[PDB]
Design a protein around this ligand. Sequence first.
Ligand SMILES: CCCCC/C=C\C/C=C\CCCCCCCC(=O)O
Ligand SMILES: CCCCC/C=C\C/C=C\CCCCCCCC(=O)O
Ligand SMILES: *[C@@H]1O[C@H](CO)[C@@H](O)[C@H](O)[C@H]1NC(C)=O
Ligand SMILES: *[C@@H]1O[C@H](CO)[C@@H](O)[C@H](O)[C@H]1NC(C)=O
Lengths: 50, 50
Amino acid sequence: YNSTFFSTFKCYGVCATKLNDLCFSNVYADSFVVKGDDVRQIAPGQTGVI
Amino acid sequence: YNSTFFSTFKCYGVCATKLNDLCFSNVYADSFVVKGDDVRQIAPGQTGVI
Ligand SMILES: CCCCC/C=C\C/C=C\CCCCCCCC(=O)O
Ligand SMILES: CCCCC/C=C\C/C=C\CCCCCCCC(=O)O
Ligand SMILES: *[C@@H]1O[C@H](CO)[C@@H](O)[C@H](O)[C@H]1NC(C)=O
Ligand SMILES: *[C@@H]1O[C@H](CO)[C@@H](O)[C@H](O)[C@H]1NC(C)=O
């Protein structure tokens, strides 16, 4: 909360206000770099080049 | 996919992933120019000058 600030943060299947009260089973992190217009394509139902 | 890139692309009444599987009846294209803050008003159920 003092260092890193996110322009997009969106959660699917779970309320964002309850992430502090849960425990998670199989956690994986995928990393990549896109341009600014292509961030809207990282979503469950989407079309486009990405 | 090599030339034109869209800042917004949103579809209503259909999932975007199925546009390659369908065939469309009465296609019309409406063209105009707005400013950056007025793009959010091209949606059903909006208020604003546009
Ligand atoms: C020029 C008129 C085309 C009429 C097509 C009619 C129905 C098909 C609907 C949508 C597909 C074409 C729209 C462009 C979508 C760009 C997708 C992308 O690149 O991210
Ligand atoms: C200080 C006045 C308080 C008014 C609140 C009273 C009722 C609320 C109903 C509508 C408020 C709309 C606020 C302006 C919206 C601008 C719409 C636009 O142009 O895109
Ligand atoms: C948060 O960042 C500032 C930046 O210098 C730092 O001084 C502060 O100690 C940090 N907070 C904590 C709890 O470490
Ligand atoms: C896409 O655009 C580039 C731009 O130089 C071009 O070289 C390439 O041939 C285009 N793709 C196709 C399939 O024509």
